[PDB]
Amino acid sequence: MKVVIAGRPNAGKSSLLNALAGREAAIVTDIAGTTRDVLREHIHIDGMPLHIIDTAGLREASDEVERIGIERAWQEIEQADRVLFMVDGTTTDAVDPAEIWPEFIARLPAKLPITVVRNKADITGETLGMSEVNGHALIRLSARTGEGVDVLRNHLKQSM
């Protein structure tokens, strides 16, 4: 089973992958379009094996390699059993993904389950942990500090 991390550039997807995999699998920098290739890591939580999949931040890109990466990101989404929609919490106060980026949500395969991840809690000062918005699971965490990531782990085990 496959969990895809997807969202805008610099949301912290690669930072999250590395937190979940417990190794420095993906390059992380503040440059949008750092990740282009699809990065896949095998993990387990508690008897449950899954593939965690990091992808290029979604946009209309003039960088050819990044454009290909973005096409591949959408292809990963097509095959996902769950998507983690990573959001830079510093960029917006909205919590409902329909307010955050309605085109992304509308484009997702029908009934692919979505978890909304508001990252960079360390900057915003948001309360860490889980809640629900319009029926979507919502988690506030810091991929950089690890603060809140166990709540993501338990969530994956319970939900899938």
Ligand X SMILES: Nc1nc2c(ncn2[C@@H]2O[C@H](COP(=O)(O)OP(=O)(O)O)[C@@H](O)[C@H]2O)c(=O)[nH]1
> What H or E segment, with its residue span, contains residue 113?
none
Q: What residues between 16 and 45 interact with ligand [Se] by CB under 6 A?
A: 42
Asked if residue 62 belongs to a known ligand binding site, the reply is no
> What H or E segment, with its residue span, contains residue 36?
none
Which CB, 33 or 148, lies closer to its own copies?
33
Q: What residues between 9 and 68 interact with ligand X by CB under 6 A?
A: 9-15, 28-30, 34-35, 57
**Residue partners of 84: CB distance under 8 A and separation at least 6:** 3, 4, 5, 6, 16, 115, 117, 152
Residue 51 near its own copies by CB under 8 A: no
Residue 142 near ligand X by CB under 6 A: yes
Q: Is 89 left (phi over 0), alpha (psi -120 to 50) or beta?
A: alpha
Residue closest to ligand [Se], measured at CB? 42
Residue 43 near its own copies by CB under 8 A: no
- Rounded CA-CA distance 52/32 in Å is 21
Which CB, 35 or 115, lies closer to ligand X?
35
Least distance to its own copies, CB of residue 65, Å: 5
* Residue of 3, 4, 5, 10 that binds ligand ALF (CB under 6 A): 10
Q: What residues between 23 and 42 interact with ligand ALF by CB under 6 A?
A: 32-35
- Rounded CA-CA distance 67/73 in Å is 10
Residue 79 near its own copies by CB under 8 A: no
